[PDB]
Design a protein around this ligand. Sequence first.
Ligand SMILES: *Cc1c(COP(=O)(O)O)cnc(C)c1O
Ligand SMILES: *Cc1c(COP(=O)(O)O)cnc(C)c1O
Ligand SMILES: [Mg+2]
Ligand SMILES: [Mg+2]
Lengths: 307, 305
Amino acid sequence: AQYCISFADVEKAHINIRDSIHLTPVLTSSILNQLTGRNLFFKCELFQKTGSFKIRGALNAVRSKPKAVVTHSSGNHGQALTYAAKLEGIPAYIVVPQTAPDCKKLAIQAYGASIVYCEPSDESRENVAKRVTEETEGIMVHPNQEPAVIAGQGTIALEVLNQVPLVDALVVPVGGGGMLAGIAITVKALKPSVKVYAAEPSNADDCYQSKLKGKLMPNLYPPETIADGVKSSIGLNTWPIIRDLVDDIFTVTEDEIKCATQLVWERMKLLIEPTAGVGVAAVLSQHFQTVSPEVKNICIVLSGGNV
Amino acid sequence: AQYCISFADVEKAHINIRDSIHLTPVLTSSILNQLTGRNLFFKCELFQKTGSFKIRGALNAVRSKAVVTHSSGNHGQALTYAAKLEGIPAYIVVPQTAPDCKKLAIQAYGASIVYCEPSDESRENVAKRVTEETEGIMVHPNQEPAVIAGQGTIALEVLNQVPLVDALVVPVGGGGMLAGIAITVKALKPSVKVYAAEPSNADDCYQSKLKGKLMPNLYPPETIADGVKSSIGLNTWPIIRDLVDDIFTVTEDEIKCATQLVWERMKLLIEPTAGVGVAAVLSQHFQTVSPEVKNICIVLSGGNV
Ligand SMILES: *Cc1c(COP(=O)(O)O)cnc(C)c1O
Ligand SMILES: *Cc1c(COP(=O)(O)O)cnc(C)c1O
Ligand SMILES: [Mg+2]
Ligand SMILES: [Mg+2]
């Protein structure tokens, strides 16, 4: 009934961010249509500013006053949050373990971040981030559980429902479930007859196990997967939305993820990152054949291109 | 302009908890009137179920599965009683290195104990693990809005029991009690002053209000007032910042002398943390409070000693 956002938050996020992000195109592939027996549509967030959808949630958090923003998610969220900060005239501090390789340190510096070091543990990441937040009088922006962020990711669905007016399902890769939850909130509020499907690595299948057992079941161990963007577990804010509003979750093997990513590179000529191959792998997977033949028009979110 | 609770939440908490708490009496002391030059009224939460006001917030949180906390003193004791009223287990997270006497005391008030290591880190994560495994909820001792709303009900009773009250004086630790009370008084009768009382040895609240920003204690405070070692937090600070009129600090010696004064001259078995409000009104700087602030109600917040 009442989740950490409603669709009103998504609409507000849309107005909030639309002048500063790309309304990314929806593309097709007859080769992938033939392989799946479906009518596929590819929402190209790999074309989004900062190279992934995450600028949606990050910009909405910064515009929704703080003197600085902080995160220890140093990948696509960190990159997105730093750009959002730049747009708003404030520094972004990224908390990074001191033991991170130079190449990662340099890449984080290169996207505009001010780096603060921690020790390589979840414990240290959070407390150093808290200290930086409290010293800079800024705010921490979580990559997937922050309601302002979830609301921002949900705007993807607003665009898809307009761009593919006869869409039957969306397929969404799931890590922390920020994108999945924002989309589920939006689709089910506007057109609940459209299916919302998550796509998840078998090697990181906390979301799949959670919906099966009916309770939040985070990955016990740090996941090993080439889909680097979906290693996070779902959390306290995204799980209830995913529990009630997401229709199914499809897991894919490491090999499925690799083959799908290569298929997209080679036959679609789109430079997606492997995390973005996860949704494509799902629609190609054996179990997706159990999806009713009436679910013909399927939009897959190609969520990033930072590779 | 909009905090983590409103007056409406306080009133709902009062209705929610009234059948299971005591409307504690307000007492007086001509000796302490004489020493202060004020007309004092003592709200006796030392007489409250579980021995402190904390049952107000604890019960409201449980009525608003299992409950979990790593605050093992008056809050854990209150939370365990609330849990038992509601037919659910209460899990108190305690460091392994805690003294046997303290482990036995926590067991004796009805808790199921789970061990952690003696760090804030370990306390929180073990508490979190117990919470997920029992499908329960963690109830924070001072930052949980349902708890804050519960403590606020003290002010409802005081305003009713002392119609001509000019000020309330409240010990502050995490500021749950202070913030709840400030929300209530300033909603109902903002002409009444809300004063906090704090140990000089744990003066984060005082320093915060001075600097205009949340300034937690840098180190674990050393003070005989065990119940107010916690710093104020993200939910209670904004209320305290905007709705509390003044914070008075007191020395360790002032706290000790006030506590013995209450024992010897009032014959009330307060715990030393409850002596802090009394020390505040006796302190030198309280003499700067306008003479028109005559009727002062001090909360004697606990008797678990
Ligand atoms: C973050 C990320 C995801 C997963 O998003 P969540 O909201 O964490 O589920 C998917 N694809 C890419 C490219 C990402 O960076
Ligand atoms: C907890 C406690 C306090 C302080 O209450 P807070 O809400 O943490 O400020 C004061 N007196 C006693 C006896 C207490 O147990
Ligand atoms: Mg997962
Ligand atoms: Mg203090």
